[PDB]
Design a protein around this ligand. Structure first.
Ligand code: NA
Ligand code: NA
Ligand code: NA
Ligand code: NA
Ligand code: NA
Length: 444
């Protein structure tokens, strides 16, 4: 009778630096993204998160807004520079924000899902080497354990890292994200230290044996298609798939980096950070996996160089990011996890959503019909996965509101709610009204 059971969580997601603002208040010190956004050329028109959506001050209105939509769960991140503004220096005022945030959520029947690290590493940590310095495993563990002990009565669903592929390859190899290095060997080592920090937090978490509390990790995953049936394109797809997906799925869920990628990367950089003890910590059992899904890739062999597959445009509709709208890969990825990696483990879609050219019309409304159709198509694939025996527990739309989209600044709008940044006014887009109906009827 219900496409989505009463227990299925309809959610929305944000991230601290993208929405909070109040960047220099109540003891907060700079993150690497504060620093990076002030370096010339790194962020669209030198946008930064100084103010963002001012959600730090407006959080009560934002929670009321979610309550009126019937939101059942809210994924947010916790800002490390608020909690430890300096090495070893706990800031109770920073903790107080997350207590009053999560108190507000619970009192409005919204379940909190907290992301421990969503890219806003404290500048003091990066000055000590950041994710390149293996000591970060201990700094992160100290941070996580403080959150578990202070917030464990408030939060029962924890995510160690958001999208470690971005924090490693996009930040240290491609250089689009903070801190903006361009060195494959660095990005490979960072990926390992991120995964090792993840394992440290899981170890600490299990030792607390908190009542009714779950821990997992969030991975951005795609599906890679070869442009043709040639052997050239099949190897290209295999490499692209190992680069995005298997490089993280395999150590976490198989206890082993993917050997084809280890050999491929080893032709270009050192891969000597791999060892048995680290992989055992990395692959500790999780309670759930969070899946961030947006699009697929169609790839063709490039010119034999490092990760130089040519991106094929198959000619289909795309978002403002240039990302193809291909809802079937949401089903294919969830099925692939079920058949190859996570099996019967609970799965959450921790991000899915789209950037479109949103405009407030003369009627004061945002008629974002393309986003309505986008979300409708992807929720239909989630329902199909559930009806085929998939263990999907919830679905978080990215994002609750338009926000600071990293190197794109405020020029990409992902919200189901529009933010007029001059006034900080919230305007429900038609997609939020559609989502409200979906939560109410649980029918699609
Ligand atoms: Na901010
Ligand atoms: Na700036
Ligand atoms: Na696991
Ligand atoms: Na679980
Ligand atoms: Na499709």
């Amino acid at each position: 009778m219900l496409d989505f059971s009463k227990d299925f969580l309809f959610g929305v997601a944000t991230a601290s630096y993208q929405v909070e603002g109040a960047y220099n208040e109540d003891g907060r010190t700079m993150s690497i993204w504060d620093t990076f956004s002030r370096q010339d050329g790194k962020v669209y028109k030198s946008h930064n998160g100084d103010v963002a959506c001012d959600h730090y001050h407006l959080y009560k209105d934002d929670v009321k807004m979610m309550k009126d939509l019937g939101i059942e769960a809210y994924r947010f991140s916790i800002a490390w520079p608020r909690i430890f503004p300096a090495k070893g220096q706990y800031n109770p005022k920073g903790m107080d924000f997350y207590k009053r945030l999560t108190d507000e959520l619970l009192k409005n029947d919204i379940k909190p899902f907290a992301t421990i690290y969503h890219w806003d590493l404290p500048q003091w940590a990066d000055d000590l080497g950041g994710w390149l310095n293996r000591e970060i495993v201990e700094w992160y563990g100290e941070y996580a354990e403080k959150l578990f002990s202070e917030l464990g009565g408030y939060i029962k669903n924890w995510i160690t890292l958001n999208e470690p592929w971005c924090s490693s390859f996009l930040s240290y190899f491609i250089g689009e994200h903070a801190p903006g290095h361009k060195d494959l060997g660095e990005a490979l080592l960072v990926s390992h230290n991120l995964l090792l920090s993840h394992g440290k937090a899981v170890e600490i978490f299990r030792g607390l044996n908190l009542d009714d509390s779950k821990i997992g990790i969030t991975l951005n995953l795609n599906e890679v298609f070869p442009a043709s049936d040639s052997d050239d394109d099949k190897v290209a797809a295999q490499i692209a798939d190992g680069f995005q997906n298997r490089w993280f799925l395999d150590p976490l869920f198989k206890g082993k980096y993917p050997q084809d990628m280890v050999e491929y990367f080893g032709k270009y950089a050192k891969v000597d950070f791999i060892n048995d003890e680290d992989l055992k910590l990395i692959s500790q059992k999780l309670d759930f996996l969070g899946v961030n899904y947006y699009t697929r890739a169609v790839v063709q062999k490039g010119n034999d160089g490092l990760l130089d597959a040519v991106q094929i445009d198959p000619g289909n509709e795309r978002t403002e990011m240039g990302w193809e709208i291909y809802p079937e890969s949401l089903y294919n990825i969830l099925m692939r996890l079920k058949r190859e990696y996570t099996y019967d483990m609970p799965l959450y879609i921790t991000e899915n959503g789209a950037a479109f050219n949103d405009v407030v019309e003369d009627d004061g409304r945002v008629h974002d019909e393309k986003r309505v159709e986008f979300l409708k198509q992807h929720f239909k694939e989630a329902k199909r996965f559930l009806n085929d025996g998939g263990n999907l527990k919830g679905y978080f739309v990215w994002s609750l509101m338009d926000n600071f989209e990293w190197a794109h600044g405020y020029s990409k709008r992902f919200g189901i709610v529009y933010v007029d940044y001059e006034t900080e006014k919230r305007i429900l887009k038609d997609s939020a009204l559609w989502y409200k109906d979906l939560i109410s009827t649980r029918t699609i």
